[PDB]
Amino acid sequence: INLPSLFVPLVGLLFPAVAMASLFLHVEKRL
Amino acid sequence: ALRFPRFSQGLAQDPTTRRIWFGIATAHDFESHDDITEGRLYQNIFASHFGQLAIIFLWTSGNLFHVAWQGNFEAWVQDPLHVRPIAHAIWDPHFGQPAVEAFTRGGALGPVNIAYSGVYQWWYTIGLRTNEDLYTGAIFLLFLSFISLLAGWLHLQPKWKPSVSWFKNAESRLNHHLSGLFGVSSLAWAGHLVHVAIPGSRGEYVRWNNFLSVLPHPQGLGPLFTGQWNLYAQNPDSSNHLFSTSQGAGTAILTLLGGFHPQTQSLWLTDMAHHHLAIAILFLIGGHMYRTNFGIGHSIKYILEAHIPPGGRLGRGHKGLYDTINNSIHFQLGLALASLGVITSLVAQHMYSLPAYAFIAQDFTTQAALYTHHQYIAGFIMTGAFAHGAIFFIRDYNPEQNADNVLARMLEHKEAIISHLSWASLFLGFHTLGLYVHNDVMLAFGTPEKQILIEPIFAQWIQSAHGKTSYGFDVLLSSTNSPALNAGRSIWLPGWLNAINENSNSLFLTIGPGDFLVHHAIALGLHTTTLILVKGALDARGSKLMPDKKDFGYSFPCDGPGRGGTCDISAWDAFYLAVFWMLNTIGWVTFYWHWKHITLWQGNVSQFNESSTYLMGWLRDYLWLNSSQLINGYNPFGMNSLSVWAWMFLFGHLVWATGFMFLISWRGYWQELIETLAWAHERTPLANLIRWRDKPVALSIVQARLVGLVHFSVGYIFTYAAFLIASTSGKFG
Amino acid sequence: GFTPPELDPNTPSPIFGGSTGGLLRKAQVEEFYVITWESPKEQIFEMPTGGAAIMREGPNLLKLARKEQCLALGTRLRSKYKIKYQFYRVFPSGEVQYLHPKDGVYPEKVNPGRQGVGVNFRSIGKNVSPIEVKFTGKQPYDL
Amino acid sequence: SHSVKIYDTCIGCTQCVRACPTDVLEMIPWGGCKAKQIASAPRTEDCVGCKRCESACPTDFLSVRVYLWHETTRSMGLAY
Amino acid sequence: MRDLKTYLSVAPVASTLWFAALAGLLIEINRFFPDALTFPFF
Amino acid sequence: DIAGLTPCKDSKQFAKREKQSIKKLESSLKLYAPDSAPALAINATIEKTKRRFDNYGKQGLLCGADGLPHLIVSGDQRHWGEFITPGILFLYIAGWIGWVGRSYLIAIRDDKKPTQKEIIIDVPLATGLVFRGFSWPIAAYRELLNGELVAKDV
Amino acid sequence: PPIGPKRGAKVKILRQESYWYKGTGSVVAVDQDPNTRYPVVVRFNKVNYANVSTNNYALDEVEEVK
């Protein structure tokens, strides 16, 4: 219920993980 | 194409990791992108401007939301001088229990950060009082950023995208911006100050739900249209006036007193509203200069071409400059950056000496942070302006269309300019360092009385001419029968003279020999940075060592080791070397400001006066002396609230130091090392099953220089910010 | 017009004890180069990648991973030992491509059977400024 | 692939050809000087950009100019 | 002798002798009138 | 006085600093023998300090709140001895040096190998040339008026 | 009728990408052959950045000066 507790991991761990995975996939493959 | 980047076909075929790096570092250089045209370039710039506006609005909205949510505003407004404003809460799972204990301040229920941006004072002065106002502002700004993004997207789409001919309509844009963006905006700010801020500083709470039922003045708009405007200044606020209360409050909405508010030690709100109204009138009048669709006004190019002196000392004068400015976007960007940097430095210089926000003059760390902030940003903006001037020389300059005008004549006697600027730099450096070393040796031998202490007599004379009476020069405003003094005795001079001669504020500080020496160091820095940048620009198109430089682009590694060696021969490399000097000069500026103000805030201006004349005084009495609490932020016996800075202080020391890596070691060594690493990885069991897809390579020469400079700058900024904030906040005085 | 010599496998390779500077995956998936010479007598020479090797009597064939390596080896064979050499580029498909000396005579000596490529009939100072070639795919020197 | 250009000021001294470490340059028949020679660059795809040719040119300004351009695995001089 | 004169006038040697003489002159001037911060004669 | 400073002769912090300096010097003297070489050296230094302070008071220097002399360079005729006549002296000497060096360079510029006379200084010619710096203020002035100080065609 | 300045003359360079641009040199030889666009040969008393004291120039690039 503590709003910071939910979001700090969400923006510091989940968001960078998904963003780095997606950008690595985009940058690193022939189109 | 067919892979990142899609804007560069040459990069997309690079089989190395370079493609990624250079893929990121050229995304906003639209002119060098494949299949680029005029309208495409202008439309992309336009949309990017919209994106920037959206980002700015979102950022300030986030500041508002956090100050309203985990802030201290409602408590802060109750007692502005005895409570620390809160920026936002800390939620770090790495914190230990003592860290949580140490970081809970400001009356919060958990670890929080103490804001030093000064937003609390600014929002308090303009009229915001409760958290509801902050929430409404945040929501409005979120809507505003959304609208900005919508505008950008809309103008991206066909049938709404402006043509190039529209972008180059300079006369109409200047008219609208002067009379609209500047004039109407300042008129509206004056309206807000009259309607909300001034009533707010007198007890009344005027808001959207009741601002039509409240008269800003007892005789609203009667005096304005009748012409008897003095009725709006007939009853100012008494000198015994508490800010946000009606005790000793007046009814004047416009005035011109010139002093400070005695309690808040900041400018009168009525004076500021009057200022904004006046300059709004000036801008509105002056924005009707150029010709548009109505058959009257001016054509800029005709004014330019008509300004050619007879006698031909300037050649053809300004003939052809309109077309080279309108067609060259880098020229426009350079001019804009130059003016912006000048006025950013002006903001920095004026904010500390003439504070406008209530109770900010008593917040010392906020003042220091803001001054250092704006000075560093101004330095970066100036360096960028010169960089883009050089870029214009390389790319958008047409020698034949600029034949014999001021620009061509600047290019053709570049050597005299560079040599004389070099002479000025040499003179300043030689003599400033000589005097500093002389004084330092004199104090080494225990004979301070034999120093060369030169009184900054010209600056003291100017201060006396403003009305200060501590040097006994008896000049305009400081005399008794001078026309200048007598002309303003009944308007602003009372308050101005009361404020300037008062010696607890920063309005024209008393100056001495240390100030003379440090100002000459400042001049040395400015002249040398200008030397590097001017030399890089004027020689961008080519020189004797590389006459065909214009064909090699703005930035390139070198021209090989032939002809003696051509390291750092590009204009980009001149900008690169100028950034170091900019950092050094702004560092001297901020060192001087911070030491003077930290010694004044302690009532110990003498100490600075004695120890500023020699360099050991700077090293010991300022850096070493004011760096004890910071380095003690955490120690084997525990930590306190300053630990976060003590860590950052070390962090900034590391970044900077690793910057020295890329600046000293160069590519070949690293390339051979990476080659042997690739061999090793390819020759090992179980890991050769994993194969890289972009061939590893050492960083490019230009890229390595850029990375080294970025490390240098980040470390510089972080370490100085940590030191300044920890030392000023450690004492809070 | 000088039929280039055909690469002849089965030719002996120089005596070498092995090294960590040899071929890598690029030779496997992209390309590698082969150099051949004659060397009248058996003698020891400096390899372009590692230590020292001995040229066998008669034809010698050496495979390198870079063209620059082949040229350095050829220069040493030509100036130190006075030996005539030729090298090829081999692709993973099985193709061979005669490379040097392209037309039977080394590029240093003018040959009547060569056309000019990338020659500009003007001094280097008569190139147009970038502004004249802006927003066109061409570069000022390509003109 | 880097772009190598030969300009008409070339005196056919041949020093650039001796210097190229990838056999990119050549000598071709010509008639505008005493040597009846001029440099050619028919194999710029193998140019590594070392600019060793320019260091050997005795004309002022240079007669052979190397403009670094798009990078390939051959131009980057990678053995892996 | 002639070659000794020639070498004795080469840049480094001549510069060191000139600067030694200048240093001695300045040292003696300071010794006779030390702690001089102004020109009082006129 | 000028810039709110006061004369060093009647200033108080200047006298206090003088006394403190002499006290510091004397503190060391009492340790050694009354008439040993170190004692004589310390006494000589004390006398030098006293003479220095008396001279500073005599010349009429200005002293600030710090008690140290300050130099006025605005041009006030009461202080020309602080920067302006030393400035004129420096300009004379520096122009002497520059004019002599330029004369040497111009003199040796006509040989087939001028560089030989630059790494190996032709002292015979230099000794004749050095004395032109006595009158360089006139030589340079007439050089400018005659129009051959500055290389035309450049 | 020889072309260009005479041998041993005094010419100043007008090629803006030359090291000795606006400088002066002594003419060494001008080839009588047509179909050569840089016949004039000039020698200078100062070397360039490549340590070279001779260069060829076109007829319009050199200009006989006093």
Ligand code: CLA
């Ligand atoms: C650029 C402005 C800005 C900035 C610098 C911050 C910074 C921060 N916020 Mg915050 N936030 C903002 C705007 C901003 N916020 C806005 C407009 C809202 C909605 C009113 C919120 C709502 C919010 C909540 C609920 C929380 C934070 C929290 C935090 C802190 C921890 C990290 C985090 O949770 O990520 C941010 C979390 C979000 C949910 C942000 C979403 C809102 C914006 C629109 C996202 C922007 C993404 C966009 C693609 C990139 C913007 C451009 C550029 C800056 C990259 C951190 C100091 C946490 C905290 O309290 O710290 C202890 C927390 O729980 N924020």
Ligand code: CLA
């Ligand atoms: C302590 C570090 C330091 C110092 C002292 C300097 C000093 C100087 N820099 Mg520099 N610079 C530095 C760091 C430094 N830089 C760094 C880190 C960078 C980034 C790469 C640059 C990049 C840079 C550029 C690009 C340029 C300069 C220039 C200059 C000169 C400007 C002219 C001047 O001010 O007059 C003189 C200043 C002095 C401090 C005098 C130095 C000499 C004193 C008098 C000692 C004399 C010797 C003494 C007799 C002892 C001799 C001992 C014996 C054994 C020989 C100056 C000498 C500019 C220039 O060259 O000017 C035209 C120039 O363009 N700098």
Ligand code: CLA
């Ligand atoms: C309105 C301001 C403005 C605008 C619109 C531009 C626009 C442009 N600039 Mg410019 N510039 C500016 C200001 C501006 N500049 C200023 C103030 C400076 C002084 C520093 C410069 C100096 C400069 C140079 C030297 C160059 C440009 C170039 C360019 C062009 C290409 C930029 C690009 O896409 O590279 C891509 C963007 C990047 C590589 C930025 C990423 C790297 C940054 C620096 C790292 C940020 C710091 C770090 C992450 C923070 C610490 C992290 C953490 C510890 C907190 C482009 C048209 C380049 C050009 O090609 O000219 C044609 C060029 O070489 N600019």
Ligand code: CLA
């Ligand atoms: C503070 C300045 C600094 C730093 C940190 C380094 C660091 C390093 N140098 Mg070096 N160097 C420097 C200055 C510096 N140098 C300067 C000024 C020069 C010029 C002379 C050189 C010249 C030089 C040469 C010629 C060489 C090095 C080499 C190395 C590396 C050795 C390998 C190693 O130590 O393993 C480990 C790395 C470290 C211990 C550094 C700190 C790592 C931290 C503790 C790890 C933190 C991880 C953290 C969890 C990351 C999460 C953050 C996330 C957000 C990304 C190393 C990374 C050598 C090399 O490359 O090795 C083969 C090499 O040959 N340097």
Ligand SMILES: CC1=C(/C=C/C(C)=C/C=CC(/C)=C/C=C/C=C(C)/C=C/C=C(C)/C=C/C2=C(C)CCCC2(C)C)C(C)(C)CCC1
């Ligand atoms: C490189 C280049 C560029 C840029 C450059 C620059 C940027 C420069 C600058 C500069 C600057 C940035 C400047 C500034 C300035 C200022 C001034 C010049 C001023 C003044 C004066 C006055 C007028 C004053 C007045 C007054 C008054 C009013 C009263 C009080 C006092 C006083 C005195 C203050 C470009 C891109 C364009 C182009 C190309 C080239």
Ligand SMILES: CC1=C(/C=C/C(C)=C/C=CC(/C)=C/C=C/C=C(C)\C=C\C=C(C)\C=C\C2=C(C)CCCC2(C)C)C(C)(C)CCC1
């Ligand atoms: C008085 C004074 C002052 C000021 C002043 C001023 C500001 C002015 C000026 C000035 C100027 C404005 C100057 C100028 C100049 C210019 C020019 C143009 C020049 C020149 C010269 C030359 C060129 C020379 C050469 C030479 C010589 C002669 C020496 C040696 C040799 C040679 C050759 C090097 C003050 C207040 C501070 C203080 C007191 C004093």
Ligand SMILES: CC1=C(C/C=C(\C)CCC[C@H](C)CCC[C@H](C)CCCC(C)C)C(=O)c2ccccc2C1=O
């Ligand atoms: C270390 C070094 C290298 C080698 C550097 C390499 C191989 C970079 C390796 C860094 C890896 C990829 C990790 C870096 C982590 C970064 C913090 C990630 C940044 C990526 C985005 C967030 C921008 C050079 O190639 C070089 C070239 C020329 C002059 C100096 C140098 C030089 O100093």
Ligand code: SF4
């Ligand atoms: S840059 Fe080097 S590889 Fe390329 S043509 Fe010139 S010499 Fe040959």
Ligand code: SF4
């Ligand atoms: S080195 Fe220069 S002059 Fe000689 S052949 Fe090559 S391009 Fe021509």
